[PDB]
Design a protein around this ligand. Structure first.
Ligand SMILES: *CC(=O)NCC#Cc1cccc(C(F)(F)F)c1
Length: 225
């Protein structure tokens, strides 16, 4: 369980910031709304890895929701091709993501899903697929990302340097783009060291989330309501 942990009690993370008044306050507050946490490896891939595992976990045993998601995943090669990725270069990554989606359908156990996401090879193939899909979705909608995010930014250079490569950190743009690309609704809780309110953001703003993540010290962990 070196990439995604077993579930722990929310208050077990007090020990990560001992004798820190603000962390202790915000974690105690968090424990009123959430019961458990799973930790991720802090290797630069933790957003993609956490979102992939937690979303697929939320689908287990839901036959209509799995059918609908599989239907969307089967179309994603078209998004990649439209943004100028070549099939023979994304094939190995697409096949690994489609395989874990079939596991959700056919096997349906937490234990099987956690084994794939802790297999360095399968898990890293899954993360690389999610990164390529994120890049494609942004490139295919460059005017939207410039209109609504940043009129001045260079989109192609951004995707080349800060989306596609393994171990590159995310910002709001990558979270919005992957959420939209796969129709995944998520909520991020923010825990920083300023004496401020514990606060969150929902992607997209009007949605009921499937996935809850905790962001602290550049790192995303998985929360359970
Ligand atoms: C998403 C991601 O991979 N971020 C990199 C990181 C990190 C990190 C920050 C604070 C603590 C850890 C520990 F110690 F690994 F939990 C990792």
């Amino acid at each position: 369980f070196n990439l995604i942990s077993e579930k722990c009690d929310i208050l077990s993370i007090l020990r990560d910031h001992p004798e820190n008044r603000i962390y202790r306050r915000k974690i105690e507050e968090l424990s009123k709304r959430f019961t458990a946490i799973r930790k991720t490896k802090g290797d630069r891939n933790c957003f993609y890895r956490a979102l992939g595992y937690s979303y697929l976990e939320s689908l287990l045993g839901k036959s209509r929701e799995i059918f609908k998601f599989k239907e969307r995943v089967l179309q994603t090669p078209n998004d990649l091709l439209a943004a100028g990725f070549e099939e023979h270069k994304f094939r190995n990554f697409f096949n690994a993501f489609y395989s874990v989606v079939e596991l959700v359908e056919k096997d349906g156990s937490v234990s099987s899903l956690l084994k794939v996401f802790n297999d360095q090879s399968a898990s890293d193939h899954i993360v690389q697929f999610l990164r390529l899909l994120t890049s494609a979705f942004i490139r295919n909608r460059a005017d939207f990302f410039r209109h609504f995010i940043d009129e001045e930014m260079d989109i192609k250079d951004f995707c080349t340097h800060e989306v596609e490569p393994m171990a590159t950190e995310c910002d709001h743009i990558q979270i919005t783009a992957l959420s939209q690309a796969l129709s995944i609704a998520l909520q991020v809780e923010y825990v920083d060291e300023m004496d401020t309110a514990l606060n969150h953001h929902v992607f997209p703003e009007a949605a009921t989330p499937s996935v809850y993540l905790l962001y602290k010290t550049s790192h995303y962990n998985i929360l359970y309501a």
